[PDB]
Design a protein around this ligand. Sequence first.
Ligand SMILES: [Zn+2]
Ligand SMILES: [Zn+2]
Ligand SMILES: [Zn+2]
Ligand SMILES: [Zn+2]
Lengths: 155, 159
Amino acid sequence: NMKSIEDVFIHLLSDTYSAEKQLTRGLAKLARAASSEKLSAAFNAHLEETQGQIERIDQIIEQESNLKIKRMKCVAMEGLIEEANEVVESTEKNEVRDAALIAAAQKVEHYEIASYGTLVTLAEQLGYKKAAKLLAETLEEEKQTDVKLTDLAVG
Amino acid sequence: MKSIEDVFIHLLSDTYSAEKQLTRGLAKLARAASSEKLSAAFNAHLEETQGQIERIDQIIEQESNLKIKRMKCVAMEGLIEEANEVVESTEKNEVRDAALIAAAQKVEHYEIASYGTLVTLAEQLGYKKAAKLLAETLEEEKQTDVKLTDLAVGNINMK
Ligand SMILES: [Zn+2]
Ligand SMILES: [Zn+2]
Ligand SMILES: [Zn+2]
Ligand SMILES: [Zn+2]
């Protein structure tokens, strides 16, 4: 029940927090499952980045102190990760799997690209200038990763 | 999925189903929006979505080995259902419009990713006309996302 812009921001930020926490487990499996070590290396590097982004949200919460992470499961992200795992189970460890796994991971990143774009806007509107900057850092990383995924997808 | 063509046809059927579901969802969301600008944005994008359905249909009529498998895109169904849940969790004001724009951007970015993959793959399989039509859709989805960011920023006019 969202009655303020602040309610919306905190709900979305908790949504994304859960998405990040889930991704820490999911990306490890996907790196394992990939045929190319290039794709496995990208999945691992982004696992380290995802831990960094979780820490950024923790920094936002610690600084604002009127903000409290709501414990909720991000259902969308859970679906997207599970769709990646279904790719791994429906394919041999060949170039076909790598194509479909890149595709699933880009769906993951673009979920995040949308989410962090909204979070930046809302934090700017509510006056959380520092939080907006941290969220913008995370946004840019997500966009960078999708771009690298698109490259591995063509290369 | 044993070949790249199979991945292509599976994703194309997924996107087709997604576009079909968006035809219903975008109209309901236009109904629910508080701002007349947001409702007009949703309706115009409904018209564009119908065009994108037509593009995939033309690709299908043109390739003739390609066959849409009747399936449900569960991801898109979840994203639509979350936009509808915003409507039921809010009054008809700028709070609803902020959260509804957010949900619509999540839908759009599912599609941006999907169509980016479909373009990449169609270029590999030799469906040049199809790759060009899919790239037209990709650019539309991207533009819709930018228009939503503008409306998100214009949603609040305090300072
Ligand atoms: Zn992330
Ligand atoms: Zn990410
Ligand atoms: Zn569309
Ligand atoms: Zn669209």
